[PDB]
UniProtKB/Swiss-Prot annotation:
Intrachain S-S bonds: C3-C33, C11-C30, C19-C51
Residues of the full protein shown: 135 to 185 of 185
Note on domains (UniProt): Avian ovomucoid consists of three homologous, tandem Kazal family inhibitory domains.
Site feature location: Reactive bond 3 for chymotrypsin, elastase, proteases A and B, and subtilisin: X13, D14
Compartment(s) where it occurs, according to its Swiss-Prot or TrEMBL record: Secreted
Domain Kazal-like: from-to ranges: 1-51
Originating species: Meleagris gallopavo
Name of protein: Ovomucoid
Residues of this chain annotated as glycosylated in UniProt: N40
Length: 51
């Protein structure tokens, strides 16, 4: 989880899915990292690809 450059005000609409510890499939690293910050450290990366 290298989200050091977050959060970011917007994310591009490529699709490179990541499966979060919340069992949500995030569209790409940008969407996943912004969610990690908003979660106050509770969200982590389960695995690459869709859940």
């Amino acid at each position: 989880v290298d989200c050091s450059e977050y959060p970011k005000p917007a994310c591009t609409x490529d699709y490179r899915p990541l499966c979060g510890s919340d069992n949500k499939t995030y569209g790409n690293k940008c969407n996943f990292c912004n969610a990690v910050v908003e979660s106050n450290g509770t969200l982590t990366l389960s695995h690459f690809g869709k859940c």
